[PDB]
Amino acid sequence: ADQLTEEQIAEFKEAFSLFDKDGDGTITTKELGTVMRSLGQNPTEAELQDMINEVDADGNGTIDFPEFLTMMARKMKDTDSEEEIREAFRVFDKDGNGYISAAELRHVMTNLGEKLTDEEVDEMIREADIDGDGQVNYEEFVQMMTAK
């Protein structure tokens, strides 16, 4: 994971310095939870464990630089917020019926600046429309972009 550029390398160091408060050179869930609690997040020990065992390739219970760097640079997981995706759902749902149709996503894509025709939007709905109603609900809209 060390094959990054010096700049990016410096960033995670500063972060590693946060996660290694005892100064042993490794991260545990206790140090992790401390950082989380400091910047404004509070996952439980099990959730802490989850990400710990993800990056911990030695399976030794502590996160080393390369493992941390994997979590930090690669993020380890493929998703992002996920739970706020249902908040963003209402944003795409401009008509406000609890479903997102092509026309709705069409407005939203235009809001990004990158234009597309209605057909490209319909294409997206065709693939994400699991119940085949011509609209996408939470899970359809979610898995349209960020899968579970």
Binding site: A88, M109, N111, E114, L116, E120, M124
Partner: peptide
């Protein structure tokens, strides 16, 4: 992905990412 006359993006809204 290669797209000339099709959407170059779509997912960039909710997974805009950091």
């Amino acid at each position: 992905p290669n797209g000339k006359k099709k959407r170059k993006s779509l997912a960039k809204r909710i997974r805009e990412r950091c």
